[PDB]
Amino acid sequence: MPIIEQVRAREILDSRGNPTVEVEVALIDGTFARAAVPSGASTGEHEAVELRDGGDRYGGKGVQKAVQAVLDEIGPAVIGLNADDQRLVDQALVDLDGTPDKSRLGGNAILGVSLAVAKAAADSAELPLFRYVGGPNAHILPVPMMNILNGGAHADTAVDIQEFMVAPIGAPSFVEALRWGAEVYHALKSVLKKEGLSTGLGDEGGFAPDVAGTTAALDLISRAIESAGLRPGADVALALDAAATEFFTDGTGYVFEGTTRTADQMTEFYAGLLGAYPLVSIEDPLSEDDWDGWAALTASIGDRVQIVGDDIFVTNPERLEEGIERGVANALLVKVNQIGTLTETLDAVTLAHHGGYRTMISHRSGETEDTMIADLAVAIGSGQIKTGAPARSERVAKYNQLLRIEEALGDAARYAGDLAFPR
Amino acid sequence: MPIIEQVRAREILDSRGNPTVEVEVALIDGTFARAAVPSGASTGEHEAVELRDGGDRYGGKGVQKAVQAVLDEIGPAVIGLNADDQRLVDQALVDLDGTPDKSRLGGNAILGVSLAVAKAAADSAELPLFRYVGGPNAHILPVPMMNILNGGAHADTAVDIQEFMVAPIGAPSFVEALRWGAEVYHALKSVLKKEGLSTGLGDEGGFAPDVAGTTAALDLISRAIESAGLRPGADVALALDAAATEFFTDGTGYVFEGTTRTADQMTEFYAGLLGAYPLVSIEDPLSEDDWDGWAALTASIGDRVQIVGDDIFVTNPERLEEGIERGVANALLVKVNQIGTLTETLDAVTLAHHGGYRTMISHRSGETEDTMIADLAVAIGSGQIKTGAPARSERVAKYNQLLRIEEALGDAARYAGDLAFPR
Amino acid sequence: MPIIEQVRAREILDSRGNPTVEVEVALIDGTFARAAVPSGASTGEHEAVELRDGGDRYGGKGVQKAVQAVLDEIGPAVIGLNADDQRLVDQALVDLDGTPDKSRLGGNAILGVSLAVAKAAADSAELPLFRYVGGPNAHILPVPMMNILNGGAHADTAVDIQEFMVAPIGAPSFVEALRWGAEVYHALKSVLKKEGLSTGLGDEGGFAPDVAGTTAALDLISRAIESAGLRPGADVALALDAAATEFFTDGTGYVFEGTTRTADQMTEFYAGLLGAYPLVSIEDPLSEDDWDGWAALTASIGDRVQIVGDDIFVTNPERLEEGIERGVANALLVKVNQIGTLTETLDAVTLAHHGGYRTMISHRSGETEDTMIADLAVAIGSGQIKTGAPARSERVAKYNQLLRIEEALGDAARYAGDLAFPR
Amino acid sequence: MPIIEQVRAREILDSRGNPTVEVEVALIDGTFARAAVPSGASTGEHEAVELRDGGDRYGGKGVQKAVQAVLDEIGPAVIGLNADDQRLVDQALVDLDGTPDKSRLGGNAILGVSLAVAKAAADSAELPLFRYVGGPNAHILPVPMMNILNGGAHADTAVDIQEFMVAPIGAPSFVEALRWGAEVYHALKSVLKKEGLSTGLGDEGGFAPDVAGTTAALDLISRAIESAGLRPGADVALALDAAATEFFTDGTGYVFEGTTRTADQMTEFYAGLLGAYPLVSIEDPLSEDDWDGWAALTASIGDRVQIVGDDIFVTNPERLEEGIERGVANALLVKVNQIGTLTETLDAVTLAHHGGYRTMISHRSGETEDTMIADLAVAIGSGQIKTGAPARSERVAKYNQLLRIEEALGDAARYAGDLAFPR
Ligand SMILES: [Mg+2]
Ligand SMILES: [Mg+2]
Ligand SMILES: [Mg+2]
Ligand SMILES: [Mg+2]
Ligand SMILES: [Mg+2]
Ligand SMILES: [Mg+2]
Ligand SMILES: [Mg+2]
Ligand SMILES: [Mg+2]
């Protein structure tokens, strides 16, 4: 039966060398699932809170407190519930915590137990995780948005756009899309090494060279796409993650490239970018509190390009409805550890689907060898995924799992190429 | 394993005394599921073709040919595939037929095998059918739209609105919604018996009295709602199924109550109805070819009420996209036997979800003791269902199955009342 | 029964974005294993060769040919053998190939099948992989040598030594050793900023600074160790990977720091290093063909430091015996894919144990999410491991698996700290 | 599961008619393994002591109270541990005893439980007892060293060496080595009968003739090897067990053959023997405490012959490290009941492997029908075994078990002939 019997937790290291929680759920017969909780560089004001130790051990980032919370409190609080009742167990956890941010028990411990329970339920049904979480109709493979060139808050560089991403929208299958992405990645590596720029990978596997500006970066990416043998826009498109909050001082304006601008001038810069390049999506173009500027930008360019809300929404339904009503950000970015449980994740992605918003399962800066977000991007049928460059196998494990998913589907699979970017 | 071993078929009677197909799929384990194929009265032409015998036996409606087709072709054509690969088996069937409307093998045989395969896959996973088809997040119980008063193409009467439906949107749970529906039904029965009107149930369990007109019918329904002890609009709302095609002569106009009117005057009549009554939804307000009039009506009153497309769309994605682009009919009506397979059903309901359209799992005129559309309306989370009045247990089996579903969910369940009719 | 039933391979991406092989050997019971084959940055003249595709697809590095080889020949050539007869299957493969380098079938396909059948002959007995491969006495956790600072043939800067490593030899347990390593890593990450340098991770997770020379690098590392809160030598030692072949022009001397030197001069440089720093191990100090210089260096400084043979031996027993005879390289470096199969690895490590040589299970430049070298370094009881810096979770997966191994052992485990570097 | 459930013990007779202990560890599954504890003719000053009854029953050698120690203390003290954790259970026993030589509970009541659990941690995994203890690479069949001619402390004779042994190093396989040993044995039996001597078997199956001097014994053995059809040195070597502690009066000297001699004289006697005969190994050449003479003898001839201590080390790691650092003897005998547990045995054999010492699993004077030392000599890959002459089926059971092992290996097996005696 799918009734929880044991809940264990241990402390491991994530892809960046910081501690994190690993939860192992054992069912009565022997079904034994294991899930590790990813982490993020920016805490925010609305996400769930990670319960860190604090002090001098591990630089104050130990998670012995969350491990102890799982081993003494959450364990018996879920031992005995029904695995296939995700909403039951997740409401149990959310009430056992009792706070609107889950900070008393930490979002990481709760998410670890939630995810391991979902994995054990999918293992029990003998379905594969994507089939369970998505049902019978889970057949779509997502377009990998590969962040190949890093800037902004990741390195000392003039550019302040965080992530520059390519998207192989013109590929016939998913495996060919992965091949094109890897080829563009190596072509860009060669192009960089040619101009005496640094080829030291950041935290996302993307490069961090000292480029002149955003336009020079996009032109370098276009050169790399051309050198691979493809056609920009018809085969490979471009995408941005601006993260304007990382350079927005409240009440003065967005200091961009040494020139203070209003929301209007940022929208003009974005319009120029969209004109001169085959951009298909921009993520967090303005700050997460400048709602009026966001509505202005959605009116201006919000039908020639996809507008992804990464920080303005925190995968919270309560902020998602408020952004739906005011006509902003016709796209969501689903990070599973910004909400704390799988159930609220599915609810927010449903709420964003029924509002005309595309979604995009995304990764964190500190990931692990867990490849669940691939299964989750296939199950919910998002048709987009953002899980880094084809390097640093914490990022490549996701692509490998998507390859295995496509092979397991077989003739049923469909690649969501160019059907995810109509504009 | 979920690999198909045997496929049988027999000929049974539906709720109206006409033959239909019953398919029994037996898996290797011992999982043995059966499913019967419903059949409606009105064929919208675009929908899949129902392969009948023709002749003198059973009035020319025998289905011995579909039974033979299942026993000689489809059986070995699916024996050996993987049950959980719904899209695999359904594409196998659709190619084995080879026609754009499945007329060579009939939509009924193909749908019977599809549904029995889905039932055996859900039984294999040991999940319940709604949990399988909907995943982990299948928790919403739909608002039952109970057709209590029949007119139009169902009896000799001055009214030409086909179905008059009530909807308990104000109930706290699903059980109380069913109770309120049954109480309104019996109150209306008493109100009818008082005025010496006929209490002979039609094909939907609804009554067929010789009332003056649409307004008199709605006033009688409001009297019945008041006599039950509830408040019209706050507790119970009203709904219409016009089926205008049943009185639309092409090139002349909608002959309503002996007066030929254009689309404009029909929209004015509908606006008057919406004003004087708490109508929340109208289904097929105009013909299925008067696209311009439909766009006009969607612009005029298509934000004060729900516009359900029953015939203008036939659960076909190719017509659904075309109706999406032209701004028409912000609601779909999902009939499983108008498309022929479960897979295309799920695809059309997905396509209508991501377009701002609410859906509504619906029944046919000739049903059976099969309660699959209840599980299907819970799984896809439509939040609405149309399965007749609480009588004629081919209609009540669905409500009973929804009660069992709610009991099995428990604390996780949520009634979709007042969240499915914002206007 | 542990008899092989199926063997199937697919093509995936490794940690560097290049293709590689992944084999999945199922057993007649249900045991289903999976092992991906690593590949290094640079190979030599004596190891087994990888069967790459060549051409334009994937930059000429596709492995579709090795996948096809597994699926047509290696598959049926082992289906039916006994899993626990590791010495049977590996000789079967080695004869089926027929060449001294496994060129006909590629070392990668052979190694994939070897490792996967080993992971199934350990999963069958329900033992854990380390307990199987090592027996009942497998209880020692190795000292992690963490490559934190990269140089030489990687960042093309003024440094020539390839890998600078730290080794927490003074820790009480393994988990504290991992903590100390991570803390030294994060301290160096800040010392770099405090000396105006870059924090771009290389291929091993180590940093790529533009520091003056070798001595400056060791001084920077010592500063980071002091800033972490530990004591150099008593808590944390140091290590080197000279990789002399990358700067040795045959017929002339080693070109170091811009000067041509003889073997004697390099030995004096290494002695000056051993002087002012707590170096415990140097790897490949001279080229893999300068045997006489190797004997000289072994007799000179082979009593005060460990001498690791990385290229002078390729995990080949036939070269290992010769290096044993002439008195060189008191330590071996075990890379599993430089010999092509598990059995030859076990034989070479046995041969190096019975000769007074310490061993060190090592990683390749392109790894995957496979964590077999952790189990293998616990099983053979090497007491040392070299698997990169605590970053880039293709490196951190090994440390996480070693943590799980220590937790599973419990009181039995012993950390081999300060018992692996007597000199 | 490998969790101990029941532990029993009874008192049986060994090969010499003295009582001994027989333990029967049972597992929860049904795994039921028994193991009898051997006992030597004479103990020393550092082994673990046997807990004899003392008194008049069985000549004071009863073990009725070591049988009781297992049924009242050790039983519940191990019932519940994990079989595959040899380190765990063996440390549990060693602490439950609490003495430096296991005297409180006897070194026979503990070793029985150790062995009978290991015979269930191998029976459970369905591996054979030799694959478990040695892993997957256990393939080497040892060179049988057959003691065919007894002298010294065994019979009233002018011979001073204890055991004269032959070793078929030139055989192609193990079965041919056993055949050659048996043929030499019968040839010697015929030569003895033909030269007017006695054929009374000692405690090892070897003969006890009344011959004069060592040289005459080696000449008899060489004549038997010649008469068998072989040639000394190329086919069959020779070996000695001086056991010189049995005639070393401390402070006076090695009185033998009517000459009191110092350690220096014995080295010349051994050198003369080594010259005139093809000796490959001498066991206990000088004494249990004459360390300086041992170092001298190791310097003198310790690279032209193997030096076995057996008594100078007692399979105790503590004395082994001292003998390593002083580098006295090139080899040791691994007697499992001189250390008390299986774990400490493996630890000492590992410690002596990594020091340049070859090992030799050996038997005791009083053995049983237990054939564990064969499985243990092939698992640790010692390449040598000393288990008596091919007679007295307590000694032949070991050879029969090695034959079964060689048959079960198949093509994987390798005979360690002439690779175990390079000198
Ligand atoms: Mg962020
Ligand atoms: Mg972002
Ligand atoms: Mg109809
Ligand atoms: Mg209708
Ligand atoms: Mg190399
Ligand atoms: Mg190296
Ligand atoms: Mg003795
Ligand atoms: Mg002896």
Description:
The structure is cut from a larger assembly and holds four copies of chain A (423 residues). Chain A is of the alpha/beta class. Chain A folds into two domains: 124 residues, no CATH class; 297 residues, no CATH class. Chain A has twelve helices and 16 strands. In chain A, the strands form five sheets. A five-stranded mixed sheet of chain A has the order 6-7-8-12-13. In chain A, helix 11 links the parallel strand 14 and strand 15. Chains C and D meet through helix 2, helix 4 and helix 10 of C and helix 2, helix 4 and helix 10 of D. The site of one magnesium ion has 5 residues of chain A, from loops.
Features:
423 residues; binds magnesium ion; 4 chains; lyase (chains A, B, C, D); 5-stranded mixed beta sheet; 12 helices; part of a larger assembly; secreted (chains A, B, C, D); 37% helix; 16 strands; alpha/beta; 3-stranded antiparallel beta sheet; globular; Enolase-like_N (chains A, B, C, D)
Strand order of the largest sheet of chain A: 6-7-8-12-13
Structural class of chain A: alpha/beta
- Encode the helix/strand succession of chain A as letters: EEEHHHHEEEEHHEEEEHEHEHHEHEHE
Characterize the quaternary organization of these chains.
Answer: part of a larger assembly
When the domains of chain A are counted, the total is 2
Short description, anyone?
Chains A, B, C, D: It comes from Mycobacterium tuberculosis. The structure is cut from a larger assembly and holds four copies of chain A (423 residues). By secondary structure, chain A is an alpha/beta fold.
